[PDB]
Amino acid sequence: FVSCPGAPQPRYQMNVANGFRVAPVLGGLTMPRGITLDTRGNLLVVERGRGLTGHTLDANGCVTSSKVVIQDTQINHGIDVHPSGRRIIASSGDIAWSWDYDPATMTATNRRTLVTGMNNFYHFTRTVHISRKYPNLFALNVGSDGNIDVPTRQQNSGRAQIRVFDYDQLPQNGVPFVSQYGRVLGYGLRNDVGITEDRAGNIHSIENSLDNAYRMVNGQRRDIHTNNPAEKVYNLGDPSNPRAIFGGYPDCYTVWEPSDFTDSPKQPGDWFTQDNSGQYTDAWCNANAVKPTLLLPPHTAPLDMKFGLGNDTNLYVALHGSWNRQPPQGYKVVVVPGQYSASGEWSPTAPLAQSRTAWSDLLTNRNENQCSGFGNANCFRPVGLVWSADGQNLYVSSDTSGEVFIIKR
Ligand SMILES: *[C@@H]1O[C@H](CO)[C@@H](O)[C@H](O)[C@H]1NC(C)=O
Ligand SMILES: [Ca+2]
């Protein structure tokens, strides 16, 4: 394999790990965000500002036709297909809806309002993940309204958190996100756009963390934002038994670079607070917040993640790239090694404190330090991931370049 019929050349140089090939399958798209495959293996793409588009594939995974499945200018990121193949869920910043779906024609009908009231203008994506282990359940993310959204200390804020809803008991008129119907799976999660599940059905989420981090040292604010805090994954466990795991936001953050803490011995993965004073101290965080399972580099902006299939026991993560770092970093897809327990729970191979060097590049730009999150990007910016059912093809969207790629084994 070299390329797909009729497909454009890539907008930017693209490097993929030895053993794989990459090529565009689509270009000229409108802000492609979340992507998935339906039960016929068709590609569905949220083109933010246009709607959900559907694309039939050939034997090589290349596109043979394109249509508009949902004509809607508000759906902005989230998409998932129910395991039955006959229902889809997609969301605006404010509302999650379902549609009846016919994969034979890629046709969505009978829009139904599920969950309401979620809008904010700061973190406005509403990731959807339908549980495969419990197909009546679905999770929705609402990120913080601001860098440091103090009300998110409370679950009932409705932000920086993931709730799980029982579709099969959901009122047909739909319900507010903050309601008894939305069981809090995790809160204190600043912006957890990527959500997936392991073979045991545990929900794993990944986070975009704090901007412009500082640390108070001797009553003076020390800028530590270049290399802190870490981006990070949480294992939120069983969505049929939600218990409101607290991830530490808006007070507690995760160390990436210990050297920045000149008066406090830290290791990667430890908690820190910016002021380390009052109630919400480093020690308070250790007693009251649950640690992540793995780290990724500051500001790299994970937006999706997916486990490998078949023989592959890795985690794959789309890093959209930074804006709040110089030089910039991310703008890639990475691989995190892991393993499954006897009952199917995924964990990383590296200990948390050793995880800074555990991950590897899969798909990269020419030079991440030449990319930018301000002005022209000069780079593709990964958003969404999905594996083909055979585990042989990994699709990757890039919103700002209008592209979807195929990575082929
Ligand atoms: C998975 O199997 C393929 C052959 O089908 C092989 O080439 C590859 O080494 C295997 N990978 C792992 C991680 O065992
Ligand atoms: Ca950030």
**In this structure, are residues 158 and 209 in contact, taking their beta carbons and an 8 Å threshold?**
no
Residue type, 273: T
**In this structure, are residues 75 and 98 in contact, taking their beta carbons and an 8 Å threshold?**
no
What is the per-residue burial (b if ≥16 Cβ within 10 Å, else e) of 81-100?
bbeeeebbbbbbbbbbbbbe
Please indicate, yes or no, if residue 264 is contained in any of the structural domains: yes
Question: From the CB of 241, is ligand 1 less than 6 Å away?
Answer: no
User: How many CA atoms lie within 13 Å of 107's alpha carbon, on the beta-carbon side?
Assistant: 5
Question: From the CB of 343, is ligand 1 less than 6 Å away?
Answer: no
Q: Please classify residue 279 by burial: count the beta carbons closer than 10 Å to its beta carbon, then call 0-12 exposed, 13-18 middle and 19+ buried.
A: exposed
Please indicate, yes or no, if residue 10 is contained in any of the structural domains: no
Please indicate, yes or no, if residue 6 is contained in any of the structural domains: no
Please indicate, yes or no, if residue 54 is contained in any of the structural domains: yes
Q: Whose CA is nearest to atom 3 of ligand 1?
A: 311
DSSP 152: G
**In this structure, are residues 159 and 141 in contact, taking their beta carbons and an 8 Å threshold?**
no
Whole-number Å distance between alpha carbons of 273 and 300: 20
Domain containing 272: what range? 15-408
Q: Whose CA is nearest to atom 12 of ligand 1?
A: 311
Question: From the CB of 172, is ligand 1 less than 6 Å away?
Answer: no
Whole-number Å distance between alpha carbons of 33 and 364: 18
Question: From the CB of 19, is ligand 1 less than 6 Å away?
Answer: no
**In this structure, are residues 370 and 378 in contact, taking their beta carbons and an 8 Å threshold?**
yes
DSSP 288: H
Please indicate, yes or no, if residue 1 is contained in any of the structural domains: no
Whole-number Å distance between alpha carbons of 202 and 127: 16
Whole-number Å distance between alpha carbons of 259 and 60: 48
Residue of 309, 311, 313, 340 best suited for mutating to test ligand 1, as the one with most atoms within 8 Å of CB: 311
**In this structure, are residues 215 and 222 in contact, taking their beta carbons and an 8 Å threshold?**
yes
Please indicate, yes or no, if residue 4 is contained in any of the structural domains: no
Domain containing residue 125: CATH number: 2.120.10.30
Whole-number Å distance between alpha carbons of 303 and 133: 23
Please give the angle made by the CA atoms of 274, 157 and 201, to the nearest 5 degrees.
Answer: 90
Alpha-carbon dihedral angle through residues 221, 222, 223, 225, given to the nearest 10 degrees: -100
Q: Which of 148, 144, 149, 352 is nearest to 255 (CA)?
A: 352
Q: Give the closest ligand to the alpha carbon of residue 392.
A: 1
Question: From the CB of 311, is ligand 1 less than 6 Å away?
Answer: yes
Ligand 1 atom nearest 310 alpha carbon:
1
Q: Which of 275, 249, 285, 267 is nearest to 352 (CA)?
A: 267
**In this structure, are residues 250 and 152 in contact, taking their beta carbons and an 8 Å threshold?**
yes
What is the per-residue burial (b if ≥16 Cβ within 10 Å, else e) of 319-336?
bbbbebbeebbbbbbbbb
Q: Which of 16, 10, 7 is nearest to 332 (CA)?
A: 16
**In this structure, are residues 126 and 46 in contact, taking their beta carbons and an 8 Å threshold?**
no
> Residue 393 is inside which H or E element, if any?
strand 393-398
Whole-number Å distance between alpha carbons of 223 and 273: 13
DSSP per-residue string spanning 70-91: EE-SS--S-EEE-TTSSEEEEE
Alpha-carbon dihedral angle through residues 179, 182, 185, 188, given to the nearest 10 degrees: -40
Resolution in A: 1.5
Residue type, 22: V
376 is in an annotated binding site: no
User: Secondary structure of the chain: what % helix, strand, coil (to 5)?
Assistant: 5, 40, 55
21 is in an annotated binding site: no
Q: Whose CA is nearest to atom 1 of ligand 1?
A: 311
381 is in an annotated binding site: yes
DSSP reduced 3-state for 259: helix
- Please compute Rg for the chain using Cα positions: 20
Please indicate, yes or no, if residue 219 is contained in any of the structural domains: yes
366 is in an annotated binding site: no
**In this structure, are residues 234 and 247 in contact, taking their beta carbons and an 8 Å threshold?**
yes
Please indicate, yes or no, if residue 159 is contained in any of the structural domains: yes
309: Cβ–Cβ under 8 A, 6 or more apart, which residues?
Answer: 387, 389, 390, 391
191 is in an annotated binding site: yes
Q: Give the closest ligand to the alpha carbon of residue 338.
A: 1
* Domain total of the chain: 1
